[PDB]
Design a protein around this motif. Structure first.
Motif, short mmCIF file in Angstrom:
data_model
loop_
_atom_site.label_atom_id
_atom_site.label_comp_id
_atom_site.label_asym_id
_atom_site.label_seq_id
_atom_site.Cartn_x
_atom_site.Cartn_y
_atom_site.Cartn_z
N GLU A 283 10.18 -19.13 -8.18
CA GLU A 283 10.35 -18.24 -6.91
C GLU A 283 10.07 -16.74 -7.44
O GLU A 283 10.03 -16.55 -8.56
CB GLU A 283 11.72 -18.58 -6.46
CG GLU A 283 12.98 -18.15 -7.39
CD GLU A 283 13.08 -16.48 -7.23
OE1 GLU A 283 12.87 -15.86 -6.18
OE2 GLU A 283 13.83 -16.26 -8.08
N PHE A 284 9.75 -15.90 -6.43
CA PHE A 284 9.35 -14.69 -6.61
C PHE A 284 10.22 -13.89 -5.63
O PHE A 284 9.86 -14.08 -4.47
CB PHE A 284 8.02 -14.17 -6.52
CG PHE A 284 7.86 -12.74 -6.51
CD1 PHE A 284 8.04 -11.96 -7.78
CD2 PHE A 284 7.64 -12.06 -5.43
CE1 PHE A 284 7.85 -10.62 -7.89
CE2 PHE A 284 7.28 -10.69 -5.37
CZ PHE A 284 7.63 -9.83 -6.66
N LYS A 285 11.30 -13.17 -5.87
CA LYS A 285 11.86 -12.24 -5.20
C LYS A 285 12.42 -10.90 -5.96
O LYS A 285 12.74 -11.09 -7.15
CB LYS A 285 12.95 -12.85 -4.39
CG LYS A 285 14.35 -13.13 -5.51
CD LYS A 285 15.40 -14.09 -4.63
CE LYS A 285 16.31 -14.29 -5.18
NZ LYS A 285 15.93 -15.40 -6.65
N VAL A 286 12.30 -9.72 -5.57
CA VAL A 286 12.42 -8.72 -6.10
C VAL A 286 13.81 -8.42 -5.87
O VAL A 286 14.37 -8.64 -4.66
CB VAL A 286 11.40 -7.71 -5.78
CG1 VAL A 286 11.82 -6.19 -6.26
CG2 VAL A 286 10.09 -7.90 -5.81
N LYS A 287 14.38 -7.77 -6.89
CA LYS A 287 15.68 -7.07 -6.61
C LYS A 287 15.78 -5.69 -6.62
O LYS A 287 14.78 -5.31 -6.92
CB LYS A 287 16.79 -7.66 -7.74
CG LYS A 287 16.52 -7.10 -9.19
CD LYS A 287 17.30 -7.58 -10.44
CE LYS A 287 18.73 -7.03 -10.16
NZ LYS A 287 18.92 -5.72 -9.79
N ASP B 150 7.89 -9.18 -12.85
CA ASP B 150 6.50 -9.96 -12.66
C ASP B 150 5.80 -9.21 -11.23
O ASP B 150 6.75 -9.31 -10.42
CB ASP B 150 6.67 -11.25 -12.46
CG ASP B 150 5.39 -12.13 -12.02
OD1 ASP B 150 4.23 -11.41 -12.26
OD2 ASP B 150 5.46 -13.18 -11.66
N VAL B 151 4.75 -8.74 -11.29
CA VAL B 151 4.08 -8.04 -10.48
C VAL B 151 2.65 -8.75 -10.38
O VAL B 151 1.90 -9.10 -11.20
CB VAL B 151 4.08 -6.57 -10.58
CG1 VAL B 151 3.75 -5.85 -9.31
CG2 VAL B 151 5.25 -6.14 -10.96
N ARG B 152 2.15 -8.64 -8.93
CA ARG B 152 0.84 -9.27 -8.57
C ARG B 152 0.33 -7.87 -7.69
O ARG B 152 0.92 -7.32 -6.74
CB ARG B 152 0.77 -10.35 -7.73
CG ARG B 152 1.32 -11.60 -8.36
CD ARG B 152 0.67 -12.04 -9.69
NE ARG B 152 -0.88 -12.52 -9.00
CZ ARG B 152 -1.18 -13.57 -8.49
NH1 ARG B 152 -0.16 -14.66 -8.28
NH2 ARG B 152 -2.31 -13.77 -8.24
N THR B 153 -0.82 -7.65 -8.03
CA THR B 153 -1.75 -6.73 -7.49
C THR B 153 -1.86 -6.85 -5.99
O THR B 153 -1.83 -5.89 -5.09
CB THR B 153 -3.00 -6.44 -8.22
OG1 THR B 153 -2.79 -6.60 -9.48
CG2 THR B 153 -3.81 -5.30 -7.84
N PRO B 154 -2.21 -8.08 -5.66
CA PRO B 154 -2.11 -8.38 -4.24
C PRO B 154 -1.01 -8.30 -3.34
O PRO B 154 -1.02 -7.97 -2.22
CB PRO B 154 -2.76 -9.74 -3.93
CG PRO B 154 -2.58 -10.53 -5.33
CD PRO B 154 -2.84 -9.37 -6.14
#
Lengths: 136, 234, 191, 144, 217, 36
Positions: free
Chosen positions: B212-216, B47-51
């Motif tokens: 939640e959003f957190k990148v691994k 899941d990615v967001r441009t901003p």
RNA sequence: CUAUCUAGCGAAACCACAGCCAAGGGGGCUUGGCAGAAUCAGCGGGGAAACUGGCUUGUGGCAGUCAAGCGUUCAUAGCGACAUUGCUUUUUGAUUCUUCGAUGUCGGCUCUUCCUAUCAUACCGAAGCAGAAUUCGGUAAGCGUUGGAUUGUUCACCCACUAAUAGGGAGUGAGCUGGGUUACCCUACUGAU
RNA sequence: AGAACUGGCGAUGCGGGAUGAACCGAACGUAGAGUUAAGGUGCCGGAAUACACGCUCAUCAGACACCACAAAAGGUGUUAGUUCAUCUAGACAGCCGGACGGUGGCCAUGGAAGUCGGAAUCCGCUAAGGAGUGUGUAACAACUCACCGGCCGAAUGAACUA
């Protein structure tokens, strides 16, 4: 037939074509009627539009007052002078042939009537039966 | 199948197609990046967001964060030991399986591995996932939030979207006057279940970034060491 | 371009069994059975083993092979209609006049009876096909559910049913009332 | 082009209401979102939405009613802002010419209320701008 | 009635239950049905359908063309300003009871007659000029500026294929004609006024009663 | 239904020889044009 | 009264042969449909002036604008489709006895049957189609489509009714209107042995 | 339409063309046998329901003499081609995510926020994301492409001719 014209019509004898002068029985001052047309007819080849009792007709006036003469108006037949049939068994007719005037909704124009009127006509129409002194 | 084909819809839009020119362009550009920068990080971001990406880039301009198509990134990295820009890169070309995504830095490792543990946002279910909340929609007027805030200040949902609710979202939604109403309460989901796509969409329609959003990250390479590092931090 | 051999795969699960003489099929599973004639279609069937069956055509024109893909999807629909069973859900909405909807049996006929439609006096009966069952919705207002194995029977019956209330000579944008489908699901829920 | 323009005016004129201006009428003018929809609903079967946004009613709405064995019509306006009397949109202009033309009572729907949260100075200067057209109009204010 | 009433009913009730699905499906079905009509329509309707379909096609071709075009990137005076830019060819027609008094001929073709006609009596006349087929006006176009102006005939000097049709005044193709110029009002050398110019007709009067003439310039 | 009238496919000789004479007129016109 | 039948008397006209129909052949031949001995009475339809060449149909002329393409090359040597601008007898729901000198024929009533390109009637679709009513469009010709007044140039009509009061062919070259240039043979049909 | 040449018919039959003034073949004593022309071979009708490659399936095909008149074209019927474009460094279909900030750009308006509408065509990060196709609410919002990217892995697509 139009608004006000109540009921259905039975098959009665079609005596009167267009163009038979008949007398008028109301107290308008009109003396006589001349039919030019019948309403609610069919059509058959070189038939004349035929009138009967209990029918609402488009018809002009020949003798009477100058205000109402020579213009076409709605009229009800009340007296046939040709033999028709009742369903309670008898055949009958009047002395002379006669019809009255009224508006297209069937409401009476005059305030009185002379002479006897048709039973079926007075049943089919309220207002000749409201203004009728004599029936049969 | 010369006739009796489909007609594909023709338009007059402004944007045009990229082709191989941008493909090979980005390929040589990462190969330019390789010798220039020193610290290399492979980034799984599903899941990615441009901003968010622009936020990360304008956070770190001394870094460079690059994303592009996978197999060409594998190409420019080199997939074999036999073909590679530098050495010890094929093995980390193996692991980069997910939506990747890559970074070229010269800063410390410690600052970034604590950065992305500190860096957390709020996002949507993005199903084949869990969402850490359940939602019952009450048997009343329906609202844009769906029972979150008080009933005085929430705005009822628009009468445009309701046939979509009847078609996509499988839910009985009956229309009294201009707001929208329901007759029974509707529970959408529970905790501890993998969310379905309609479930994810209804919480999207409510506009709820409950997840939640957190990148691994999985790994790290340094050019001067010329060595591969493996790190699963989320 | 006169493709020489075309072919598709259909997947039989463990529970269900299928018997295919010439172009007749029976498909039997836990919910029950179905049958279908396919003699009009001019193809070949073959087992390989017992989880996969192969349909095929030799010397296909475009029409012949498009029929091949079709017949696969038909048989798969039967398979689903046994193992899951299909389930179609409708609602019957009115502005002024509540439908009276009922089920009746006339000599075993299973008619579906609607009254008070748009303030009418008319009774309209609709037959029920074999192999499909009704239920009016318990604890849900203004809703009816059908379930069956034959998907074609189900859909034909409900499509008939909304084809009955095709209100006529009247502005559809105003007379929003009518009986319509909510959705097409399976019976199960879970699987 | 002109025939299609006339197609649209055909459509719109068919959507026009029915008025005899000669007859006993009650013009109802007020500010936007004062409760006129609630008012006409409570007197008369006409369900106009009550929703709190600026241009809710855009045209002239009728409700017929009866009292003391008589027949009355009630003609509510879409509502007015200042646009100060020199040049104006056709909606307020038709409202003005309705005031000008129809020979019956006129009714001001005042909000001595917490709602309709435009300020009372706005309300009263609007009123002051519409003072000169209150010559022969039988104006009747009511606070809501 | 009385209002935006259907839109109101839409706003309050949602315009049907099942409208979206049918509209979607209908536009799906249109692909097959347009071609069904292209194969069906035995007579005049295939023609209109095809003509119409050709038209919408070519307009879409213009649309792509103008999209690509977007994507890739007169000394007149003042008082003329503000203008918008025998044994054959004869049937003996024997008249009367005793069919020997033929004496008669008929003109079946257009002609300009002039102002004064002073039509001769019946007994001495041989040729019959009917009344309707009399053009006082004709459309004259200008070659420069392509302007079409509906102006009168003054005279016919030249008529091809005879010297007789000159004097008769037949207006067929090839006939050069004396045309007024009054509304245009050009100022010539000396400041005169123009009243007559030469024009060449370009259409048959029989096939159309309009008479197009190019002004000789 | 009411199955309606057909046109034939019969020969109807006048149209055959009309076709041949028309054809020769067409080819004559083509030769008159073909010098240009 | 004949017609009809019977007893008796007893002709003529006319006659190449004689006959069943549709398409075709720029009454008979070709291809097909049927045809069952022999016959009677009515019958009036027949009895050695209408596609050059697929004719005709709904969409103006002329000068331009794009030119799809064509010209083996040329774009203005040159063609050129679909669209589109150009007035076309009085621009503001202001408005001409344009039916006025055509010696030219066309105008009209009962009855069959056909076609459909439908005027209503049946079903349908779309239309701001709230309804009632109504406009367009589709399938469809099974059934139906009125009664009157009318001419020195009725011209195209009004009057009314009716669900409507749609359109054309093959028709009376046998009855009728104008300012007017052997139906007796056999045929088939309807009735009959 | 007019001329000029030539051939047929006219005085002339026969076979075929279903029939025939104009077409195709053909040197007329009577007879026999044989072989063939033009045309044909499912049955009428004497002759192969021959062999073989292809294409065609018309809700009134065609069996045509042919360039020829409706005619230039329409058509999600069908077969074969031509010229271009894409690609396991992942073509096309699809399902999933993003599809942004300055920005609600300027007048314009009551309201106009990419889409009542006039004119502008920017840079920023960018794998990619327009001063912004289409549904849209009074505006806003939400959704969709065009554009990229994730799963799949295989050839596909535009135009044109015939």
């Amino acid at each position: 037939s139009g608004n006000g014209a109540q009921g259905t019509k039975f098959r009665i004898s079609l005596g009167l074509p267009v163009g038979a002068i008949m007398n008028c029985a109301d107290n308008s001052g009109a003396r006589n009627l001349y039919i030019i047309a019948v309403k609610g007819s069919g059509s058959r080849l070189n038939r004349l539009p035929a009138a009967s009792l209990g029918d609402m007709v488009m018809a002009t006036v020949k003798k009477g007052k100058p205000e109402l003469r020579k213009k076409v108006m709605p009229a009800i037949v009340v007296r046939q002078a040709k033999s028709w049939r009742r369903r309670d068994g008898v055949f009958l007719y009047f002395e002379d042939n006669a019809g009255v005037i009224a508006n297209p909704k069937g409401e009476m124009k005059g305030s009185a009537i002379t002479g006897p009127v048709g039973k079926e006509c007075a049943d089919l129409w309220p207002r000749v039966a409201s203004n009728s002194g004599v029936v049969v | 199948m010369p006739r009796s084909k489909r007609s594909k819809l023709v338009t007059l839009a402004q944007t045009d197609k990229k082709g191989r020119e941008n493909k090979e362009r980005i390929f040589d550009e990462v190969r330019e990046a390789l010798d220039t920068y020193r610290y290399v990080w492979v980034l799984h971001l599903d899941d990615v967001r441009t901003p968010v990406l622009q936020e990360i880039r304008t956070s770190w301009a001394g870094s460079k964060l690059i994303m592009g198509k996978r197999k060409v990134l594998q190409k420019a990295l080199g997939e074999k030991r036999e073909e590679e820009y530098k050495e010890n890169l094929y093995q980390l070309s193996k692991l980069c399986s997910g939506v990747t995504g890559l970074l070229f830095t010269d800063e410390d490792v410690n600052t970034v591995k604590e950065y992305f543990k500190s860096y957390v946002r709020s996002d949507y279910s993005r199903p084949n996932t869990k969402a850490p909340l359940t939602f019952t929609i009450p048997e009343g007027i329906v609202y844009s939030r769906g029972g979150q805030i008080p009933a005085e200040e929430d705005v009822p949902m628009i009468h445009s979207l309701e046939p979509t609710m009847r078609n996509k979202f499988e839910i009985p939604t009956k229309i009294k006057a201009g707001k929208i109403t329901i007759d029974s309460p509707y529970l959408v989901c529970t905790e501890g279940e993998k969310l379905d796509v309609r479930q994810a969409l209804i919480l999207k329609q409510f506009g709820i970034a409950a997840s939640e959003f957190k990148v691994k990250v999985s790994a790290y390479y340094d050019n001067d060491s010329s060595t591969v590092e493996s790190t699963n931090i989320n | 371009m006169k493709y020489i051999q075309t072919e598709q795969q259909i997947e039989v699960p463990e529970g269900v069994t299928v018997s295919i003489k010439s172009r007749i099929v029976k498909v039997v599973g836990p919910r029950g059975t179905l049958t279908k004639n396919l003699k009009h279609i001019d193809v070949t069937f073959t087992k390989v083993n017992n989880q996969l069956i192969k349909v095929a055509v030799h010397n296909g024109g475009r029409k012949h092979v498009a029929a091949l893909r079709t017949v696969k999807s038909l048989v798969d629909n039967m398979i689903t209609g046994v193992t899951k069973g299909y389930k179609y859900k409708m609602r019957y909405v009115y502005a002024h006049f509540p439908i009276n909807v009922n089920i009746v049996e006339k000599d075993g006929a299973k008619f579906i009876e609607v009254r008070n439609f748009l303030g009418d006096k008319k009774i309209r009966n609709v037959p029920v096909r074999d192999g499909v069952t009704i239920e009016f919705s318990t604890n849900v207002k203004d809703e009816i559910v059908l379930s069956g194995n034959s998907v074609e029977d189900v859909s034909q019956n409900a499509a008939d049913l909304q084809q009955i209330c095709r209100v006529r000579n009247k502005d559809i944008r105003k007379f929003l009332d009518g009986i319509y489908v909510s959705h097409k699901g399976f019976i199960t829920e879970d699987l | 082009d002109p025939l299609a323009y006339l197609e649209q005016v055909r459509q719109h004129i068919g959507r026009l209401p029915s008025i005899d201006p000669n007859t006993r009428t009650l013009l109802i003018c007020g500010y936007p979102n004062v409760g006129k929809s609630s008012f006409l609903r409570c007197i008369t079967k006409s369900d106009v939405d009550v929703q709190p946004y600026a241009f809710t009613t855009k045209s002239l709405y009728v409700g017929h009613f009866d009292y003391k064995y008589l027949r009355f019509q009630a003609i509510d306006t879409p509502g007015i802002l200042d646009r100060p009397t020199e040049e104006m949109n056709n909606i307020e202009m038709q409202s003005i010419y309705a005031i000008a033309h129809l020979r019956s009572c006129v009714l001001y729907f005042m909000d001595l209320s917490e709602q309709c949260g435009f300020t009372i100075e706005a309300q009263v200067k609007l009123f002051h701008s519409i003072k000169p057209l209150f010559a022969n109009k039988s104006v009747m204010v009511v606070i809501n | 009635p009385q209002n935006d009433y259907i839109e109101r009913h839409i706003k309050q009730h949602g315009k049907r239950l099942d409208h979206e699905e049918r509209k979607r499906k209908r536009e799906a079905r249109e692909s097959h049905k347009i071609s069904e009509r292209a194969q069906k329509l035995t007579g005049w309707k295939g023609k209109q359908f095809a003509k119409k379909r050709y038209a919408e096609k070519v307009s879409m071709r213009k649309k792509i063309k103008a999209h690509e075009q977007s994507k890739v990137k007169d000394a007149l005076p003042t008082y003329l300003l503000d203008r918008e830019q025998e044994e054959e060819m004869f049937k003996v027609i024997k008249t009367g009871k005793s069919r020997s008094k033929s004496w008669k001929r008929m003109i079946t073709k257009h002609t300009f007659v002039g102002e004064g006609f002073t039509r001769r009596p019946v007994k001495m006349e041989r040729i019959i000029r009917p009344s309707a087929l009399r053009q006082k006006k004709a459309n004259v176009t200008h070659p420069e500026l392509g302007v079409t102006v509906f102006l009168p005939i003054l005279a016919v000097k030249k008529n091809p294929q005879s010297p007789m049709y000159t004097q008769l005044g037949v207006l067929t193709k090839g006939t050069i004609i004396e045309v007024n110029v009054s509304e245009l009002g050009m100022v010539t050398a000396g400041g005169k006024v123009v009243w007559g110019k030469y024009a060449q007709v370009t259409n048959e009067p029989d096939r159309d009663g309009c008479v197009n003439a190019v002004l000789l310039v | 239904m009411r199955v309606r009238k057909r046109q034939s496919r019969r020969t109807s000789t006048k149209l055959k020889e009309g076709i041949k004479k028309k054809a020769s007129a067409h080819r004559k016109k083509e030769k008159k044009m073909a010098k240009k």
